[PDB]
């Protein structure tokens, strides 16, 4: 058996086709087993709609997940990606910075 805890990055992209629209990314890469639950949260809430959910896997088993939907942010709200994970003894929030 094996187990990697993932790694977590959190950051805002605006596809080049569309400049107007803004999306928030969490990248949870890396881990093992695939197991997972991965949430974006606005003002510490989970965001039922996140559209984009993609899952992949390298040669030696280990797994990639990049979980991203459009957003509008403004100064006042906070977001996060929230992970669970079997190597985790408490669920990790990254927080967004906002110049990210």
Known sequence: ?????PKIQVYSRHPA???KSNFLN???SGFHPSDIEVD??????????????????SKDGSF???????FTPTEKDE????VNHVTLS???IVKWDRDM
């Open 1 to 5: 058996m094996i187990q990697r805890t």
């Open 40 to 57: 974006l949260l606005k003002n510490g809430e989970r965001i039922e709609k996140v559209e984009h959910s993609d899952l992949s896997f």
């Open 90 to 92: 408490q669920p990790k």
């Open 26 to 28: 969490c990248y949870v």
């Open 79 to 82: 977001y996060a990606c929230r």
């Open 17 to 19: 086709e569309n400049g």
């Open 64 to 70: 990639y997940l990049l979980y991203y939907t459009e």
